[PDB]
């Protein structure tokens, strides 16, 4: 974040370390020597335009890429930072339900041995694309005045690298914040209600208690299924939970207390909680996230330089291309402090089904209610045909001679005498003929 030349990721020591790109090309005017001569190498490089251009392009491109890439891989954001995108991604999640185990029955087993498991529910990824360049500049006098000694070259290279990479770190942090904002905006976070932690000390203590309760309930050994984008019954270990807390909020709470909410001690937390000032999404305060939830992949990291003969200067272009993916099966909590409605969003089990012309499918709805009250779900079919009817329990029955595609709809009402408030979940059902 404040890189100096002493951060030597690769190669041996001493400034004379690089000074060899002449081998790969050139090495007829620069002395291939490792000594105290600094004027000779400067004169050899500075002879003409061709030698200048070759040396500058090589040093800027290859060493710059190596240095910044090997420095940006150990930033405090390395936890969610993975390598190059794999081939054959298929842009699809595949998670299997943690079901129970059948009882051993010889009579039942002898009846059928070719049965298959339930569908795994294959939902797509949530991704965002990142593209940009930073575009710094080199003046000609810098090369002239950077060869007086063996430390000026160090200062010049380190100045370039530090001038570029610091802005990239800030953009990475801002992109993480923007992704969290967008995910909350689409409403897939499971909200937990808190009220004005910064207002009073009692509010802060109550927020800490709710923090601890949610973190303890997320890490239940037998699974939860409550906190998810869809009911899948996963389980998250305590050592993987990540906390994204607003800066002014985090300032008030001590490092402790919030530390003892989880089960490790202080030092093991500074790499498990990031601080971002301002969410700008109604009343978002803090977000509790499984380490798997956020995943970033990188595609392109390339330098190219251009030379302007009229102005005697060179340019810069770091092209950083990334695909920030969001998983929909990892646990996620919103922890919003506002006036959110009683029911945020309902989720329909078997979202995708392939029912025959005479079969049936059982659907269940999971209401995500912020209060302790009970809400009833009214099922509907939409679609449009004769003979297709769904029961009050969600059991859909398909009649013969049908060709349209049905969309099971689950609706809840949290309104009043006037009802401009509908929370609806959709399940797309495809039909196959017999």
């Amino acid at each position: 974040m404040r890189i100096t030349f002493n951060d030597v990721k690769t190669s041996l020591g001493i400034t004379e370390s690089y000074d060899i790109v002449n081998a790969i090309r050139f090495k007829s005017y620069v002395p291939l020597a490792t000594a105290n001569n600094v004027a000779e190498v400067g004169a050899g490089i500075l002879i003409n335009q061709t030698v200048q251009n070759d040396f500058i392009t090589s040093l800027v491109d290859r060493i710059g890429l190596v240095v910044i890439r090997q420095v940006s891989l150990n930033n405090p954001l390395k936890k969610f930072k993975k390598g190059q995108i794999p081939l054959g991604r298929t842009i699809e999640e595949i998670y299997t339900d943690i079901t129970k185990e059948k009882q051993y029955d010889a009579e039942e087993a002898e009846q059928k041995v070719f049965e298959r498991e339930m569908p795994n529910v294959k939902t797509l990824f949530h991704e965002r694309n990142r593209q940009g360049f930073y575009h710094q500049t080199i003046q000609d006098d810098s090369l002239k005045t950077a060869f007086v000694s063996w430390g000026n070259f160090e200062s010049f290279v380190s100045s370039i690298i530090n001038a570029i990479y610091n802005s990239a770190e800030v953009d990475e942090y801002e992109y993480m914040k923007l992704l969290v904002d967008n995910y909350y905006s689409k409403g897939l976070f499971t909200t937990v209600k808190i009220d004005e932690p910064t207002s009073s000390t009692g509010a802060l203590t109550e927020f800490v208690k709710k923090m601890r309760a949610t973190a303890r309930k997320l890490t239940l050994p037998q699974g939860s299924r409550d906190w998810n984008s869809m009911a899948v019954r996963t389980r998250s270990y305590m050592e993987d939970l990540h906390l994204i807390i607003d800066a002014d909020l985090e300032a008030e709470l001590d490092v402790d207390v919030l530390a003892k909410a989880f089960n490790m001690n202080r030092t093991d937390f500074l790499g498990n909680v990031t601080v971002i000032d301002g969410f700008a999404s109604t009343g978002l305060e803090a977000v509790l996230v499984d380490k798997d939830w956020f995943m970033v992949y990188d595609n392109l990291h390339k330098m190219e330089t251009v030379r302007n003969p009229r102005g005697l200067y060179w340019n810069y272009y770091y092209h950083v291309w990334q695909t920030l993916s969001v998983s929909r099966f990892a646990n996620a909590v919103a922890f919003v402090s506002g006036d959110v409605p009683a029911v945020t969003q309902v989720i329909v089990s078997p979202n995708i089904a392939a029912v025959k012309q005479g079969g049936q499918q059982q659907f269940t709805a999971y209401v995500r209610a912020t209060n302790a009250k009970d809400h009833k779900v009214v099922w509907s079919v939409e679609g449009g045909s004769t003979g297709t009817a769904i029961t009050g329990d969600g059991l859909l029955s398909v009649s013969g001679n049908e060709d349209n595609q049905l969309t099971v709809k689950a609706t809840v009402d949290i309104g009043t005498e006037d009802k401009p408030k509908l929370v609806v979940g959709e399940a797309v059902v495809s039909i196959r003929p017999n």
Partner: peptide, 12 residues
């Protein structure tokens, strides 16, 4: 690529 891709005959 690493640093080694640019060979150094002046290493020793």
């Amino acid at each position: 690529l690493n640093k080694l891709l640019d060979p150094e005959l002046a290493q020793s």
